[PDB]
Amino acid sequence: DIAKRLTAAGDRKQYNSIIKLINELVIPENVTQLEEDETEKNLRFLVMSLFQIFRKLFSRGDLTLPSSKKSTLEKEQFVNWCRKVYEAFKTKLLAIISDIPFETSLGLDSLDVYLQLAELESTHFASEKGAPFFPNKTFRKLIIALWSSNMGEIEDVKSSGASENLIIVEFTEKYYTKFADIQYYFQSEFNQLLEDPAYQDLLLKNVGKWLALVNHDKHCSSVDADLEIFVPNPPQAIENESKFKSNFEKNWLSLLNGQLSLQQYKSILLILHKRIIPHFHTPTKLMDFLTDSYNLQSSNKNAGVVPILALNGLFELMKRFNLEYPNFYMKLYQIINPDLMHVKYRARFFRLMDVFLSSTHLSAHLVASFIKKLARLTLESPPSAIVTVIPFIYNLIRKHPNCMIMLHNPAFISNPFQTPDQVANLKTLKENYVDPFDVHESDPELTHALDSSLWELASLMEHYHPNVATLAKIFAQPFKKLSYNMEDFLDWNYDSLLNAESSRKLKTLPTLEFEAFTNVFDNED
Amino acid sequence: YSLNHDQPVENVIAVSPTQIVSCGGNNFKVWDLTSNKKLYERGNFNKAVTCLDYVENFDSPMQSALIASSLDGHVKVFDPLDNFQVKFGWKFSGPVLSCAVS
């Protein structure tokens, strides 16, 4: 146990050993077997972690002095025995990373650091009389263990996110991000690993580990904040920026081929434009993917949020290369629906419809349809959507002033200087008035929303929230304001709403009721 | 009278004393004006045709030329004598909003 471990450690680091070296080297197989037997059988020993750390230090000293560097004459068993013990320690570390029932925090979370420090020191300590950093075999074995290491259900976290494997999360914390070369060599070994058939039939499966590996805005190809190096001599790894981008492109598309689940579908759609689309040589390859995500018409009831998420990447793709989605404003008119105000992603869509409806080549009937439908949607809505709908209607009416007949029709005004025949005609036409707005029309220009009027905002002027009602008072106020800073009005939530309500500007004193609800308190007492 | 181009028109020019060409949407249509009636329509673009103009009698193999500019980068030249067939085009570095010739 700990006694034999510390004695064998002192013997291995003492001066030299041959038979005791053989015993303390075959003892690591026994330590691996004991940990593999106690896996989900003891789960609290820490002698296993001490044995891994001690065998790491012993093999580190053995790779310092007696490594399998080269040979001159008749040392044809010492190098084979030392490399055999080092390869068995590495294979035990890879089995230790692959075989773990759950987040046991020792047998994988220390074997990862063991294989990492082993390859980090084994950059040198070979025949390489140059500037190599060749871990490639050990690294390919590391990542195939890292993707075979399936835990219980923390992969594909069915609420949101990517994967909650503890050692993979620690890897993307400090063993993937903080440098340049090991992520590049990871992408290269990944895009060699996805080409032999058995490994690719296993590697298109657990994609969530890779989503957790990538969605972090801290890549070596991303020029926002760049890194340093820990490896002694990096072998033209940072040079081929084309090779990193091309590898990133092809493994992205090749594992986007495989077993799309809806949660990680929405995850890659949300990160599609701000995270990965600059790291593509040809981003037109994703155009088919997000155009079918945009016109996704599925029977699934939560498959109505994915057009709203495909919009950002698809519009950035159109803008960078002017391709066309036909019937664009018809599809954008049918995308607004009562789901879109109750959805989680409102500000992400409305800060894009700011750009879509500011176009100088569209019609007053089109903007009329887009605000009359939005008002009939906003009459049954949270204030989170009220306070982003009504300044949007303000800015659209301010940019298309012909749409102020929906707020103010001058044919329905009774001034005191009128003919009796005029007030007669006024009474007959306001009795023979019916509004022509039809919600089931698919065409914005063919919707009669200019010929209709806009009652929903006037009804909205009496709202339970004072800030919301005083914001809706501006449609009876004049229009001296030019615009409203929609990105300042956008993401007001229930939580931040009552946060600012508890942390408001002044503080009046509360009052009491003189109503005396003595017996009947509600109508329910 | 009224000529029902179905898309919202962006430009209307007059070629003959009789026929006029309206662009709007992905196509352009030509209309005989003595008979109130459409007779050609070319929809050879991806996005909306923003503008048109027309040339006559200039030193050219083409005796007349209608060129059309279409919000996707393209400006194309159509020959009114063989049924408004496209003969040449230029691609530009962004959406082309207006065009003209000498």
């Binding site: 081929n257 799309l260 579908y265 155009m287 088919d288 993917f289 391709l323 | -």
Partner: peptide
């Protein structure tokens, strides 16, 4: 859902239109 590849056929279609 998709299960075929990420192709380039919208690009090709509005190249040939």
């Amino acid at each position: 859902t998709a299960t075929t590849t990420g192709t380039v056929t919208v690009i090709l279609s509005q190249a040939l239109q």
